[PDB]
């Protein structure tokens with residue numbers, strides 16, 4: 001099945017998921033010189049004080065930190081969005097080396113990693129229904145650069161030993177995702193897709209301009225994870241990123257001057 005090798009990676013996904021060659025695929029390169037400032041965009045409202053993390057899972061493609069999304073406890077609103085979007089999970093994409101790993105790029109610059117906070121539109125009732133709608137999801141994307149450690153990431157890093165291989169999970173309560181946000185909420189936005197199969201064109205992307213800094217040691221621990229299951233040949237979970245896709249008939253809008 002699909003993955004990030006030579007034989008099963010992004011360049012093959014279209015055979016099982018033809019929407020891979022669609023009109024609104026993600027990620028994309030963000031050309032900062034052609035993204036136009038849109039004064040009509042609102043400030044983003046990130047309301048994560050009541051968030052309830054539950055569990056962390058290695059799904060064979062990344063690790064997901066999962067939230068209780070049975071009520072409006074951690075929501076994203078404002079920005080480009082109409083209505084209320086509930087946080088369901090976050091995960092990352094990262095590289096084998098610090099010079100690649102992000103999905104979005106900025107003027108062709110690749111960051112070491114990218115965080116995706118995934119939220120679904122409450123008007124559709126559940127995640128599975130939301131992903132069938134063009135405005136079903138809002139994904140907040142945050143770039144990671146290597147420098148100073150991110151204190152608020154360390155709790156994540158230190159549990160990764162317990163979910164080394166595909167299908168392992170661990171309890172992961174009381175984690176506060178506010179500790180993963182940069183200072184500024186300035187953003188770019190465009191309409192796109194999930195970046196992994198099934199590649200559904202259901203996402204309003206909100207990509208923050210300001211990266212967070214993580215330490216080399218932190219990212220090194222991500223790279224100790226495995227794509228494989230327990231007692232299978234070890235294949236390090238690295239380079240779990242889809243490259244930039246054609247922008248096609250889209251515009252990327254900036255919330256800032």
Ligand SMILES: [Zn+2]
Pocket residue numbers: 091092093116195
């Ligand atoms: Zn992602």
